[PDB]
Paper text:
Isoniazid (INH), a successful frontline TB drug for more than 50 years, targets the NADH‐dependent 2‐trans enoyl–acyl carrier protein (ACP) reductase InhA. This is a key enzyme in the Mtb cell wall synthesis pathway and does not have a human orthologue. InhA inhibitors are known to modulate the tertiary structure of the InhA protein binding pocket, in particular the substrate binding loop (SBL). Herein we describe the screening of such a library, in comparison with other fragment sets, against the highly validated Mycobacterium tuberculosis (Mtb) target InhA.
Crystals suitable for structure determination were obtained for fragments 4, 9, 12, 22, 24 and 34 bound to InhA. The InhA–NADH co‐crystal structures for FGC fragments 22 (pIC50=3.1) and 24 (pIC50<3) were found to be in accordance with the FGC‐FRAG set design principle, in that additional interactions were observed for their FG with the InhA protein. The co‐crystal structure of 24 contains a unique tetramer with four slightly different binding sites. The amide carbonyl FG of 24 forms an H‐bond interaction with the InhA Tyr158 residue and the NADH ribosyl‐20‐OH group, while the NH H‐bonds with Met199. FGC fragment 24 is able to identify distinct interactions associated with both leads 2 and 3 a. Fragment 24 was found to overlay well with HIST‐FRAG urea 12 (pIC50<3.0), with the embedded urea FG having similar interactions with Tyr158, Met199 and the NADH ribosyl hydroxy group. Overlay of the urea 12 with the amide 24 led to synthesis of the merged amide 36 and urea 37.
Residue numbers in the entry:
A (entry chain A): 2 to 269
B (entry chain C), C (entry chain D), D (entry chain B): 3 to 269
The structure:
């Protein structure tokens, strides 16, 4: 039947219909998953985006920087999925970095106040969410987060790479904690996708030739990747997140699955 | 079903303990039409495979034999019907002479023996890919079996060196397979109690090496955040099926760790 | 002498147990003219450093303080001489509030505390590099202290996350330093018995974390093919000096493992 | 001098372009007493090694030859004097037949050729270590030459597979050498324009070699934060000397990257 048939999954990180989280939600719904969605700040606006999804799913406010939002989260999810019901999956598709820590802005010129906000949202929050939702999760469950390979330094990504490095390490500790509940915790290291964060927020930080800079990335990535890569299609990444939410990778935890077309395994 | 309407070649079945036996079993449970290859003890392999959920054709394949590999693509077509192609290939073949493993010192392994080991455990992954890529479908997958060789461990000795060579081979195969729209990956499994494994644990290859593997196993389940049961090959078989499916479409030249998460934990 | 006629800034001396104390000692033994930075307890730091082979100027430096970093380059030149530049910088600074390490649960660390930890242990490496690269000579070297964070270990918790962030910071610093002809590297040391470490082993931060560190040490010496004596910081200090010298000229944005070889061995 | 009063065996000199020639030169400049091993073209090697800063004995050594390896330890003692031991061994031996490396397709390499390559490039590191560890001093060092095989690159094909196998062999040698107080490491050099390399690359690119080598040279220099000059083997030779010295005493079974830091940068 459906890959995620009869599974209750919380999905965070939907802002646009371009968002990786939107496509994860779409593919999971196509596979018979009952979703619960998280939104940040503009909640009346996110509802209009999620209305374009295959099916109706409850939407909850969640600012990961907000301690009251996280404390109330587990209870708010239960009132949304029914008492005596638990989650089978959690998707962390949250990332942020102030522009001072991106693009052409010099690496040394990023104030720690900005880098800290970035690390809080992009890495610390993965642990914040896991703490908040593990009590309402089922043994056999899965936590999946989004990653960009930070093992080698790349220009323009700067302090966002540092937060991804921190995230990769956070995921390994979460794995230990989640393990006590019979829950797996993994990251999907995706290749580039023309989402809003990329196209607009990262693109903004690149200056005059930003457009060709982003196009050169797709071209070089499609080149390295033995099976090619399309920055305009989030479906391969969404499918990979669903594979992790399913019961088909049962002995995989505290790990990184590379959904990048195989570009990381190739030098040229 | 997960592998519904998929033609998959599975190699490496010798016992009902074999990782390939469990891959075959789970694949069949998921609606896959299999083709099986066997080495040397074919009478026994028929007998073993007869206990699978469904009947699947069995073909002779010694990876060291050039005539066997040259005829392989044609023999598979004659078994799956003309104008039909494979959607998956499972390489679950491994070998290392007794001199290259266990209590026998690392330096006392003759190159003739280490070479046989490398031929079968690593070079053969490329031999099979060359042989079967022409009869594969775009969207298909090649999956091989691996043990994490990034750190040196006692007793595994020269098999670690063959698995290191294999990890590298897999990355070149991905380039070649990529031209056909085929993915190539390895599943890095945790220690599994096959017949050889439990014989070695019973100090067959030697007592010092016997307790070594036993410490490895106990250590693996401690380190693994979700635990590791070396008496259950089903998590590994399920992971190979995930790779054969259409659910990891952007993953190639890679290693998926189906080891209970132990490679990520120091203690 | 290995570092003959070299001006090196050394940070991170607080006791005679400090890895920075031994780096300073070995560097001085090799003909290096040092400049030392101290944090908060300067009266004590003056007093410790007085027991070094030679007299070296001591400067106040809180990496969390923006005024301290802005004035740093000037203060160093007032200490080494006008028209003189540094040939080396040693970052031996680390910190993590008690809620981020030890027996305290991983999930119970407030971000305010984790942030302080990351600021001092990782961000500061970039803060120091920004501050001192203008007063550095082409051929120069920046060396930082690291603990291998690639695998998660109990008790280290959020200090591991800061080390992971540091490894990444070092790779970007490498790019920046490269413009000045300066190398940037980290020395991944094995566990060393500092006063802090010796305290934890005595169940200061809780018996469960005390036993954990003891198993870590015991395991490290087993794994290390040449052994690991956590009561001897001299091998680590010698490794930092090799990086400060002109003998690893093509090595930048990297990690040198001074851990007895433990990271390469599974058992 | 860095290697003052040290007896070092150096293998792999064939041309004045050879990485082993530059290691020998720098080691001699630092006060090392050398012993040289040569293969096949000994008449030519003698003439080349006369152009070195000092006279060093030359011994025949085909790593494929079992009689050569069995007699090696005795031949070295007869050359360095009885009761004297080696403090260092340099393995700068590599080989891959045309079919396994170049413009020839990955799948078109016969195993007979790939096996010769693996024997010489990887297995030999263990062969030499077995042969010379009995005549080595505690504190001693074995150093081998490696090209980063972690990611697959075009043309390098099976030489990458042998480098992968080598990285793993070095980790096992590290365990064996550890029993004698000997360290075992690899230097992961960036591309060096040696005569062997020029022909390998030159032969692969055909007529279109000019422009492509220029982009390749420019590519390395960009990626390397401190730059990379293929015409200069001195940074690599200096790095091998740092490993032969007493300045990296707690580093074994490891890889030191002398590539200008190119491996740490994505672009
Ligand atoms: N686009 C790529 O190339 C790419 C590649 C790899 C990984 N990623 C990762 O995928 C994830 C999603 O990014 P995307 O590219 O889909 O773009 P996006 O714009 O859709 O995602 C950013 C999301 O983070 C949320 N967010 C930010 N701060 C928050 C806070 N304080 N509390 C709650 N939510 C907050 C935003 O509301 C938004 O939905 C991120 O983790 C990103 O780093 C993106
Ligand atoms: N058992 C474990 O703990 C474990 C863990 C990780 C990986 N593996 C790997 O999984 C694979 C399967 O091993 P296993 O543990 O199931 O043991 P196994 O003995 O059941 O499987 C090895 C197979 O290789 C076959 N083979 C040997 N020489 C051959 C040749 N010349 N031509 C063709 N086939 C040949 C054997 O007949 C056998 O079927 C191997 O690659 C092994 O290295 C095993
Ligand atoms: N001890 C080990 O086992 C070990 C192993 C590997 C790496 N390390 C690393 O080596 C470094 C030194 O640690 P150590 O073991 O010598 O202990 P330590 O306590 O002697 O060193 C840490 C130093 O950080 C300094 N510091 C703290 N806050 C500061 C601030 N705001 N500004 C400037 N300096 C500040 C302290 O004065 C102290 O000198 C740390 O980065 C640590 O992570 C330690
Ligand atoms: N040149 C580069 O760009 C580069 C980069 C990284 C690593 N390396 C490595 O450096 C080493 C030296 O390579 P090079 O570029 O100086 O080329 P080279 O041809 O000058 O050196 C290789 C040596 O191997 C010897 N050799 C071959 N077969 C032998 C055998 N059977 N027995 C004994 N010796 C044998 C040759 O006589 C020769 O001296 C090799 O291990 C190579 O893989 C080279
Ligand atoms: C753990 C692992 O990889 N095991 C392999 C080892 C090589 N091999 C084997 N070798 C000799 C006799 C029978 N089998 C197959 C199983
Ligand atoms: C091995 C390691 O990382 N050690 C560090 C830990 C953090 N730190 C510290 N934090 C608080 C009090 C004193 N020291 C410095 C030493
Ligand atoms: C970069 C690298 O690994 N270079 C090696 C390759 C193998 N080799 C060689 N192979 C065939 C003929 C002569 N030399 C020596 C140089």
């Amino acid at each position: 039947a459906g890959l995620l048939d009869g599974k209750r999954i919380l999905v965070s990180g939907i802002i646009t219909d371009s968002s990786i989280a939107f496509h994860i939600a779409r593919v999971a719904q196509e596979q018979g998953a009952q979703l619960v969605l998280t939104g940040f700040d503009r909640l009346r606006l996110i509802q209009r985006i999620t209305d374009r999804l295959p099916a109706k799913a409850p939407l909850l406010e969640l600012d990961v920087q907000n301690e009251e939002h996280l404390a109330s989260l587990a209870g708010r999810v239960t009132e949304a999925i029914g008492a005596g019901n638990k989650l089978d999956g959690v998707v962390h598709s949250i990332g942020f970095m102030p522009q001072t820590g991106m693009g052409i802005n010099p690496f040394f010129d990023a104030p720690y106040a900005d880098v800290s906000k970035g690390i809080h949202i992009s890495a610390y929050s993965y642990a914040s969410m896991a703490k908040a939702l593990l009590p309402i999760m089922n043994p056999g469950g899965s936590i999946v987060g989004m990653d960009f390979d930070p093992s080698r330094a790349m220009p323009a990504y700067n302090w966002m790479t540092v937060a991804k490095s921190a995230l990769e390490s956070v995921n390994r500790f979460v794995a230990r904690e989640a393990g006590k509940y019979g829950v797996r915790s993994n990251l999907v290291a995706a290749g580039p996708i023309r989402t809003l964060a990329m196209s607009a927020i990262v693109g903004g930080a690149l200056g005059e030739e930003a457009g060709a800079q982003i196009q050169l990335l797709e071209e070089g990535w499609d080149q390295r990747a033995p099976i090619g890569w399309n920055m305009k299609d989030a479906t391969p990444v969404a499918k990979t997140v669903c594979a992790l939410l399913s019961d088909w990778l049962p002995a995989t935890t505290g790990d990184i699955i590379y959904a990048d077309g195989g570009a990381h395994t190739q030098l040229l």
